[PDB]
């Protein structure tokens, strides 16, 4: 039965990645006064399959300057982790109940960067190396605030488990007490994915494609789908932590429904933002995260350390 559950958790995520590429294109088109794919199928529901099939039908590249081992490992790892981050998620019941699920998320995400690093290094092209170093800077920038934001939120949950947030929000979202932390977490998830305005790892206007510039159809598809999967993942994280779906033990289907609605909202917001803003300079990202988010993050961490004490609202350990 567990393998069937694996399927019911995996194949829909990939279909959703594909139709997320679709929704991205169509939303950006209508924002840009254009339509977006409507030719390939009814309103374009076959463009993703066309793209994927076409890519996995193309000649891949085995250049002469590359370390083929890492060149091939990196996309494998990217996709693997993009799919593995979805397992401990409660919707409302997870496939793998982990007590330290938050830390699993953190570590797997911090690991997904090495796909970019090793790809850009192996490719042995200057633009690839530039994308890799930009990823290094981006991680060094956001990873400090990520964990402190998350700790400050969890100090009212009582644990690193993703299933106690459901009982924590049983009456009221965690956005009201933590909307500053929610905003900073939103932007930091925006950065974790190398997504606009932080699309610096593949900045087409400075670096033709970054770490992808030597990669070709299949591996490139792997990278791309990993990106568009981590997008949905981080939206789901935002909407399990700060937004709380209705949990009535006799009605988990409503929980899944509302979870999906909120995830769609947050993802469409990601696309909105890509369409609405220019791109940062990768030094300004560091300056932001280290001069506006980290000081405030420490202040709020102290605030949420104290609040349970001068309120007697310390959470329980299971």
């Amino acid at each position: 039965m567990f393998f069937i559950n694996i399927l019911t958790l995996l194949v829909p995520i990939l279909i959703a990645m594909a139709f997320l590429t679709l929704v991205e294109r169509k939303i950006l088109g209508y924002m840009q006064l254009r339509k977006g794919p409507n030719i390939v199928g009814p309103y374009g529901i076959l463009q993703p399959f066309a793209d994927a099939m076409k890519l996995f039908m193309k000649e891949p590249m085995r250049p002469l300057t590359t370390s083929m081992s890492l060149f091939i490992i990196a996309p494998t790892l990217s996709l693997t982790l993009a799919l593995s981050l979805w397992v401990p998620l409660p919707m409302p019941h997870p496939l793998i109940n982990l007590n330290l699920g938050i830390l699993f998320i953190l570590a797997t995400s911090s690991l997904s960067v090495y796909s970019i690093l090793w790809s850009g290094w192996a490719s042995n092209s200057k633009y690839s190396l530039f994308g890799a170093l930009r990823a290094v800077a981006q991680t060094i920038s956001y990873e400090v605030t990520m964990a402190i934001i998350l700790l400050s939120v969890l100090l009212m949950n009582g644990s690193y488990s993703l299933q106690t947030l459901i009982t924590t929000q049983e009456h009221m979202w965690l956005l009201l007490p933590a909307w500053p932390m929610a905003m900073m977490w939103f932007i930091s998830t925006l950065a974790e994915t190398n997504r606009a305005p932080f699309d610096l790892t593949e900045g087409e206007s400075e670096l033709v494609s970054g770490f992808n510039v030597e990669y070709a159809a299949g591996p490139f598809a792997l990278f791309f789908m990993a990106e568009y999967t981590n997008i949905i993942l981080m939206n789901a994280l935002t909407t399990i932590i700060f937004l709380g779906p209705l949990y009535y033990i006799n009605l988990p289907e409503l929980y899944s429904t509302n979870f999906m609605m909120e995830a769609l909202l947050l993802s469409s917001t990601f696309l909105w933002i890509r369409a609405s803003y220019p791109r940062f300079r990768y030094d300004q990202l560091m300056h932001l995260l280290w001069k506006n988010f980290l000081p405030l993050t420490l202040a709020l961490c102290m605030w949420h350390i104290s609040l349970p004490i001068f309120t007697a609202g310390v959470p329980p350990y299971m």
Binding site: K35, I39, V40, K58, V213, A216
Partner: protein, 156 residues
Amino acid sequence: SRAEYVVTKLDDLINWARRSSLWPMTFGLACCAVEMMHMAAPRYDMDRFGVVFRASPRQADVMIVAGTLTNKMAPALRKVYDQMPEPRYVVSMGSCANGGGYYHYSYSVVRGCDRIVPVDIYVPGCPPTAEALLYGILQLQRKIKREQKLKIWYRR
């Protein structure tokens, strides 16, 4: 359940994919690049057809030679084309690219991009109306509709 029929349908599918997803390359040399843009614009939405400008040749499927090709630029054009992975198509846009055009008798112009790379479709004009470039894209789509590769493999 004839294998020849199955192969014809499979080839239809292959071509449908490679056709409804044509990612060109951000390679514009001269005026004709403006009409390329305008064909990317709302009135003529490229993505509507599955067309997407990717900047890396290792990800592109077709290159539109959108303007004049000088002798100082031909090596780079041939290199980029060489770096595009098969299946790879080419589209000559304008009169400069087809036969040098208004600069045919110049000392610094190749009298046709068809000397440096092989061209599938020629789009005439100076500049070609974006509508015409789209007509050419669809002409290419049909040419791909008529590749019949696996049938050939089965007949070998």
